[PDB]
Design an enzyme around this catalytic site. Structure first.
Site, short mmCIF file in Angstrom:
data_model
loop_
_atom_site.label_atom_id
_atom_site.label_comp_id
_atom_site.label_asym_id
_atom_site.label_seq_id
_atom_site.Cartn_x
_atom_site.Cartn_y
_atom_site.Cartn_z
N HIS A 1 -49.65 25.40 21.31
CA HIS A 1 -49.19 24.02 21.38
C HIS A 1 -47.76 23.87 20.87
O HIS A 1 -46.98 23.13 21.44
CB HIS A 1 -50.15 23.09 20.65
N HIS B 1 -61.03 19.56 18.45
CA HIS B 1 -60.75 20.04 17.08
C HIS B 1 -61.31 19.07 16.02
O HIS B 1 -61.91 19.49 15.03
CB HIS B 1 -59.26 20.29 16.91
N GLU C 1 -47.80 20.10 15.23
CA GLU C 1 -48.48 21.32 15.63
C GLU C 1 -48.12 22.50 14.70
O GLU C 1 -48.94 23.40 14.53
CB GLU C 1 -48.19 21.65 17.10
N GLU D 1 -55.98 16.55 12.58
CA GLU D 1 -56.19 16.29 14.00
C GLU D 1 -56.24 14.78 14.32
O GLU D 1 -55.93 14.38 15.44
CB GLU D 1 -57.46 16.95 14.47
N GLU E 1 -53.08 26.59 18.11
CA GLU E 1 -51.97 25.68 17.76
C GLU E 1 -50.61 26.34 18.00
O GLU E 1 -49.64 25.63 18.30
CB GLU E 1 -52.07 25.15 16.32
N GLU F 1 -57.47 17.83 20.82
CA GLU F 1 -57.60 17.20 19.52
C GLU F 1 -58.98 16.55 19.34
O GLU F 1 -59.48 16.50 18.21
CB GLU F 1 -56.43 16.21 19.29
MN LIG Z 1 -52.74 21.00 18.89
MN LIG Z 2 -55.47 20.68 17.28
O LIG Z 3 -54.72 20.87 19.23
O LIG Z 4 -53.47 19.86 17.32
#
Ligand SMILES: [Mn+3]
Ligand SMILES: [Mn+3]
Ligand SMILES: [O-]
Ligand SMILES: [O-]
Ligand SMILES: [Ca+2]
Ligand SMILES: [Ca+2]
Ligand SMILES: [Ca+2]
Ligand SMILES: [Ca+2]
Ligand SMILES: [Ca+2]
Ligand SMILES: [Ca+2]
Ligand SMILES: [Mn+3]
Ligand SMILES: [Mn+3]
Ligand SMILES: [Mn+3]
Ligand SMILES: [Mn+3]
Ligand SMILES: [Mn+3]
Ligand SMILES: [Mn+3]
Ligand SMILES: [Mn+3]
Ligand SMILES: [Mn+3]
Ligand SMILES: [Mn+3]
Ligand SMILES: [Mn+3]
Ligand SMILES: [O-]
Ligand SMILES: [O-]
Ligand SMILES: [O-]
Ligand SMILES: [O-]
Ligand SMILES: [O-]
Ligand SMILES: [O-]
Ligand SMILES: [O-]
Ligand SMILES: [O-]
Ligand SMILES: [O-]
Ligand SMILES: [O-]
Lengths: 266, 266, 266, 266, 266, 266
Positions: F69, F181, F35, F148, F66, F178
């Protein structure tokens, strides 16, 4: 120039072997805040000083002492690795040694012949990015206090990671030296702050945008930092507080690059 | 969680391009003591704190602010790289640009398309070894004062490495924020030292070998450090001085390793 | 240019899986003295030679062979990782696998899908700082002897870290090739020393301060090295011995730097 | 334990400043084969030896000497950086300094205040991956001969990269010490080879697949290496030659992994 | 196993020397996205595959080709370094060489004897962290497309960084091979996506929290990404858009650590 | 500029402690494809874009996400480290904990006080070499899809490395993000490929040596890749196939270096 004696500064022999503790002690030898960091930082700073002998000599005295500590930690690791398990013959002698083997650094046996490395417990090489020598001793004496603070925290933890009284005897000596080093570096720090200023470097107050110099800016939504509001800072001026910091700088708009760069960005 | 606005915290636009200054400012972006180190250190320490909200919130406030500074330095580098020379066409246009090219980071053009990297001026990648989060905030608030001290030293140097008033305007803002950060972290340090002790960690005095805790040991033949003898240390006790430190620990004699290691040492 | 066959140079299949041995063998693939170091060192030196074809071709021959060894180690690691434990379903099958899991590299499963990495056993990435190509083959042939010596030492240790006869068969082949490579590089070394001189580089004898070229200097207080006194060195001259090396260079005193640097040193 | 004197082992003062030469000499301080590599390698090997004092003491003697050389190179760099240009005021004073600035390490001024770093000329941090201490002194004395060979090659090149007679005087001393170190380590190497064997490690001849131990294998289509065919190797056996090496090991076929790994490979 | 021919895959000789271009081309040899990264990534992935031969063979075919490109770039760099200036005697025969010297990698001469390194233009060592081999070829074929995309972008830039038609001829060949490699890897990618799914890995749709799988979340205050709202994603489902993403997870409160850790946090 | 809320984007609390899972999750925090890589890559690319707001804002939106995350993974690790064993007193309480201790990262306790690091599971520091920002968004959107993809593969593996439903709830959220993304970056990729071309960069077709642009070259003796022959590539042209690629570039011979380099090569 340097000279060496084979006698250690202080005892560095464990009562019994323990290759797991050997791995932990790699932090003090090849780690971020360990003895090699102290040795190289203090000698670098000392060699680079053109200033007062009081501090230049303190740095060279202590850097040279740290070389003794590097030697001690190395020696302790070697003794702790005696008879460590590394293959099938050892497991046949005592199958419970599989647990010990699982926790060891594989390279202690394979690369070094059951000897210390210059890496941390995870095999990451010591490197010069751990060292600070900036030319400014107000900054660097603060660094040295930190180096001895982080190191003494680690040594304190190590004390609770073994029951070996030989290992602990060495750690008790190091804890005391790190107390001395914290205190001597704090004294130097305070003298230098009085000479040059409490803010590093001390000769930039006219230049900086003073209106922003004592404002606590609240960027995370907790309110704990509001307790600093109205307290007197070390330079004698109170902190103010901004609950909602402002974005004062505008929206960036950089010129696109030359076509020869092929910066295809839509 | 975080949210972003496109507006910068403060201006980060130069009056003119200068790709040599762009390379210098990579120290503040991707270097040892730069804004990424501050961002990641303060956020890490803040996330890791289970203690007083005054300090947890201070750390998260400041780490979040440092993300704004990362954004500013990145933006300033991009503006400074506008129209930078990178090939024969540029040298045909102005042959004197050869000197500029010689001093540039080759990767600014080749790898990044005349944009910032996350490296230092020498292309060394920013790495997590620059970050400290130990679990002990007495130690780590000291680290944070150092981070801001080394950084503000570098920013002060940068001020004398350009005459661009737009670059200088940004630097004047950063100098002031670094004054605030130095002071707020010093205040936290002082409160934590009062609570836990002036030596870090503060709960090991009985364990350490106290006879060695206040002795200055003269390992380098300069005599400057003798000036500390008799001065009162910050814990209230005077330093003593040892002209000739003694090797107290004996000569190490570690056991030879198992023959399966092939440690042929003579 | 290169071409590849899917057939291995020599067998690289174990009798049984063993993910601990897989981790050890990462030293031979991604470690300091491993096969990637040999491959890249010998190819780099071979490409860089403008000298005798006897040595240029030897280097390219051997560098290309080392590529085959990289392939063998990679293959062996993949076989050794077959059926390796990595999650709760494996512990449900056999709870005793917890010990195996504890000793594994977590990335073998998580990052690589139970396949080899290009790291050492501790996850440290192979890097080009392990490679030497200097332009002088008297020096570099010595390096190549060392490369094969450190590697064969490690391979010998690995032999005592498993009882798997399939793993041992591969190791017995590599030991033999490392004997050949040590010998061929020593022969090149000796021919080159006869051509250019026993000291590298061989054309600086008039320039160096010859007074100090054969003196053993006693910097550590052990007296073991005094045994070298009076022995004839490889160039035909005897070693002398200095019990108390002198410091001949004076005390340095560098000029204080420009105030724009803010070098506040007391 | 160690002690320090402020006096240098030998002169380390240049006749004139030269920040470009300061940058080159960073190779000798923080580079792959430089003095820090020698210092740390010899000390490490010496501390790790449980064998004959003749060799253990030689290593500690020489490692301690290398610390003096680290100090000399550091000092030389500091002198060489006196008055080095670093900002617009210097270019206002003398615009011809732009070429010098373009060739400098930006961090010499910005990070260190016109002082030495512990990096190489390109700012790559010195790291412990440059150090070898294996537990086998037959291998490691060979490494030490290489360390001094690569270093003396670099020192020889440096001699041709300056006309400063002060710098050259220091280099002439270091050349001579590197002659001594090469010769002493070759003597130890020779004695250890006579004792343990010419192949490292010397106790694996029965175990290795001897049929492959003296075969030169022609993997690159040049024929220069055929000149080794029939020559007597250092162990007394002749090399044979294989024009077309064969792939003896079969085509690998590893088992597909557990579906929980999601190894979708087609 | 591999075999080598001395003939290069394609021409790699410049019309004339240029040590600045040699330094740029170090990106293609030792850099993040260069030929060594391709060689090691494709060989690693190929060795690690237990799947379809179409893809395993493609990887080994291409990895082996990349070794030829490594050889070409190394060769080109060596030619480009011919007659490069490195000391006072060069500047005497031609003083205009000073600017060239300023822009060179100091180690090309000093360390390598005017030969290529395995570093990037800034001296940063190539390392295995640049390599991906995950066990999943849907992911890794995407990685390979990217490797060839970033590389071809750099080669394209290099084309505009020289006017040497011999250098350009080599670059024109490499550009074409990178077109082929992008295309072959895209075809593999597409076939693998058809077999396993457009999301990697393709077998987790039931497990993931589907309600969040097609929501564009607006964390930065620009509104440009709103243009994706209502567009059909590659899996056939439309993106939705959330102007104000919500923090759904609560405020963490982790348990304080054991006192043996000395986690003094206020 | 950024602002922070103490509430997490989504739950990050495990049902039970597990320091082995904590170590695994260091991959998602400090690892190659984790991340922090996403956060720094997307913010870097977004700040560096001068092009379409659709994509610049997408990058800044996602880079900011992110950061949330990173915060979640950090938090989860800290909870998982609660009450982890680290010394003899824990083994006295329950000797079975030895297996757990063997598998832990020794620095989690010793360095961080039972808190997360910014390293991978093997203690290797996160570094900026994991980040790509090139200036070309056709290349970099491809990179982002890869980022990703590799990340979601690792998260999917992690799902099968625990049975803790609190850990799995977090993972289920991350898998879904993900997916989003991957899809949004594929959409950007597709739009950019339509605008600029399917080959990156798309403006070099005339320059490249077209005759080599669609030829599959068989360098490894497997025949699997022949299956691409005759298939239509994504640019609409079919692949051809060369069973025996030819070496077209001759045997290079670089000039021997100046004697001042001491390139003694035979
Ligand atoms: Mn992430
Ligand atoms: Mn991501
Ligand atoms: O993500
Ligand atoms: O991610
Ligand atoms: Ca707040
Ligand atoms: Ca003294
Ligand atoms: Ca001695
Ligand atoms: Ca040959
Ligand atoms: Ca937005
Ligand atoms: Ca094939
Ligand atoms: Mn100490
Ligand atoms: Mn200390
Ligand atoms: Mn800041
Ligand atoms: Mn700050
Ligand atoms: Mn081999
Ligand atoms: Mn070999
Ligand atoms: Mn030396
Ligand atoms: Mn030497
Ligand atoms: Mn290629
Ligand atoms: Mn390619
Ligand atoms: O200490
Ligand atoms: O210390
Ligand atoms: O700041
Ligand atoms: O800062
Ligand atoms: O070998
Ligand atoms: O080898
Ligand atoms: O030396
Ligand atoms: O040396
Ligand atoms: O390629
Ligand atoms: O490529």
């Amino acid at each position: 120039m340097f000279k060496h004696t084979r006698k250690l500064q202080y005892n560095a022999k464990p009562d019994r072997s323990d290759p797991i503790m050997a791995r932990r002690l790699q932090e003090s030898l090849g780690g971020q805040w360990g003895e090699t960091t102290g040795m190289m930082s203090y000698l670098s700073q000392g060699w680079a000083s053109t200033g007062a002998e009081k501090y230049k000599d303190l740095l060279l005295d202590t850097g040279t002492e740290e070389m003794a500590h590097v030697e001690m930690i190395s020696t302790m690791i070697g003794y702790l690795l005696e008879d460590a398990p590394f293959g099938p013959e050892d497991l046949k002698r005592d199958p419970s040694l599989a647990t010990t083997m699982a926790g060891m650094d594989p390279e202690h046996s394979l690369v070094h012949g059951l000897n210390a490395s210059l890496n941390n417990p995870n095999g990451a090489a010591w490197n010069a990015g751990y060292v600070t020598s900036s030319g400014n001793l107000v900054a660097d004496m603060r660094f040295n206090v930190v180096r001895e603070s982080e190191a003494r925290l680690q040594v304190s933890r190590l004390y609770s990671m073994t029951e070996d009284e030989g290992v602990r005897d060495m750690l008790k000596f190091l804890l005391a030296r790190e107390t001395q080093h914290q205190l001597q570096f704090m004294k130097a720090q305070e003298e230098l702050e009085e000479k040059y200023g409490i803010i590093v470097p001390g000769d930039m107050k006219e230049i900086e945008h003073s209106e922003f110099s004592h404002v606590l800016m609240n960027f995370s939504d907790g309110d704990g930092s509001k307790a600093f509001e109205g307290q007197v800072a070390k330079d004698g001026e109170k902190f103010t507080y901004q609950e909602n910091p402002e974005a004062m700088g505008g929206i960036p708009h950089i010129k696109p690059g030359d076509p020869r760069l092929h910066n295809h960005q839509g």
